[PDB]
């Protein structure tokens, strides 16, 4: 029983193209983008996600992160050694 490798949609998330059939979410408080496709969020940012926990992760060449995780209206991030929060709306 080999586990699945990854989700290949995170490559499009890394490039910045939204998944097909998804809807946009409004992110406030920092530089991040989020989409909702199958009751999961896909987040494109260069910050570090601390509290809510993610399911899958990819990294680009220039330092951009892509996450696959469950839905939540709040994110806890670290900016430059300082911990703050991001607000997610439209869920």
């Amino acid at each position: 029983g080999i586990p699945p490798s990854a989700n290949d949609l995170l490559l499009h998330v890394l490039e910045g193209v939204p998944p097909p059939g998804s809807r946009r979410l409004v992110v406030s408080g920092g530089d991040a983008r989020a989409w909702l496709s199958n009751e999961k969020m896909y987040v494109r940012t260069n910050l570090t996600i601390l509290s809510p926990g993610w399911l899958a992760s990819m990294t680009s060449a220039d330092g951009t992160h892509a996450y696959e995780m469950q839905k939540s209206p709040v994110l806890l991030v670290s900016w430059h050694g300082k911990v703050m929060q991001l607000k997610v709306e439209g869920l």
Partner: protein
């Protein structure tokens, strides 16, 4: 519902305290996004000792109130003095002066992550006129930082 600016910050207030510090005699300089505060040692300490005067805490409060207006990650405090006895005594004196100044600045509420402290002694003078003691222009404390975003 979202905030509209950095809290407790105003550009008119920044200009006002920059002008007030330049009229008092504390040198405030800005090139690009780098900021410099230069303070003479006679306005802070006694005659070549690491003991603050009681009246310099108002000036330190003014400097802290100026420093709370920006967002930053690291601050650097560097001390310079003049030649008195040897090099070990002046390096130890400058390190103690920078330690005390940064201790009071960290005791006050500046929202920085790292504060670095060093004392260079008399290695880097800014003026070739070296006749004074602590009244010399090249006996000073320097506070450098970069404004973030």
């Amino acid at each position: 519902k979202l905030p509209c600016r950095v809290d407790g910050a105003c550009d008119a207030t920044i200009i006002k305290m920059m002008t007030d510090l330049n009229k008092k005699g504390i040198k405030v300089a800005s090139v690009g996004q780098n900021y410099l505060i230069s303070i003479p040692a006679s306005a802070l300490f006694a005659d070549q000792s690491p003991r603050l005067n009681w009246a310099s805490y108002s000036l330190l409060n003014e400097i802290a109130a100026f420093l709370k207006q920006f967002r930053k990650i690291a601050i650097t405090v560097t001390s310079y003095s003049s030649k008195y006895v040897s090099v070990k005594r002046e390096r130890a004196l400058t390190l103690a002066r920078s330690r005390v100044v940064s201790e009071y600045l960290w005791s006050q509420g500046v929202d920085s992550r790292i504060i670095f402290t060093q004392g260079l002694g008399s290695d880097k003078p800014i003026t070739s006129y070296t006749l004074g003691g602590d009244r010399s222009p090249n006996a000073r404390v320097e506070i450098t930082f970069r404004r973030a975003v």
